[PDB]
């Protein structure tokens, strides 16, 4: 049995930690909702 607990508000926060890159990837989506890399 699954249950939900509140974790916070949904708001944009100024001066948030900026990280992560922006890759352009060739992907395929199968009938089971799983992505895979195409090269």
């Amino acid at each position: 049995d699954m249950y939900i607990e509140r974790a916070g508000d949904i708001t944009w926060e100024k001066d948030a930690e900026v990280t992560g890159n922006s890759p352009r990837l060739d992907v395929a989506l199968d009938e089971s909702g799983d992505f895979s890399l195409v090269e």
Binding site: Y3, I4, R6, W12, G20, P23, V27, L29, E31
Partner: protein, 156 residues
């Protein structure tokens, strides 16, 4: 029980202790999460019960109590915020510029932030605070890191 708008953790007591299996968005009385988090099972909110209303394995989305309400979209140019809710850790906003998943049926935004699988369902936001999609369905790149798509449903 609790229907207040906001981000929520999805827990289970079926394994050892209390385990966070995912996250979700409560908006307009509807709970939005990723299909692989709940597998379409019923949810509990204190004494109340949330029943699935719509869902689709290919999109990897599911809504509870009503139809999917989230319809904001990434503009293709601006930075976004992953409001990450990791297991055992406090909710935290992470700003990033999304990449692109190029598919045979069009391009989808993608966020390259690596978080535990139990973070699946955490919302991705625009500058206005609107939910443009959920984190938790993507691919594993050569480095071993996870790159998730910005998965958005359709508001009917």
């Amino acid at each position: 029980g609790e229907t207040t708008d906001g981000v929520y953790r999805v827990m289970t007591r079926r394994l050892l202790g209390s385990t966070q299996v995912g996250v979700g968005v409560m908006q307009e009385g509807v709970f939005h999460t990723m299909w692989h988090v709940t597998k379409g099972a019923a949810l509990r909110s204190g004494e109340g019960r949330l029943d699935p209303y719509w869902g689709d394995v290919k999109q990897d989305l599911v809504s509870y109590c009503g139809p999917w309400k989230l319809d904001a979209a990434w503009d293709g140019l601006s930075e976004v915020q992953l409001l990450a809710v990791p297991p055992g850790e406090r909710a935290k906003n992470i700003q990033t510029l999304p990449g692109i998943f190029k598919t045979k049926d069009g391009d989808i935004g993608a966020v390259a932030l690596d978080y535990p699988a139990g973070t699946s369902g955490s919302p991705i936001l625009d500058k206005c605070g609107r939910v443009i999609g959920l984190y938790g369905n993507g691919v594993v790149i050569k480095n071993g890191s996870y790159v998730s798509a910005i998965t958005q449903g359709k508001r009917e």
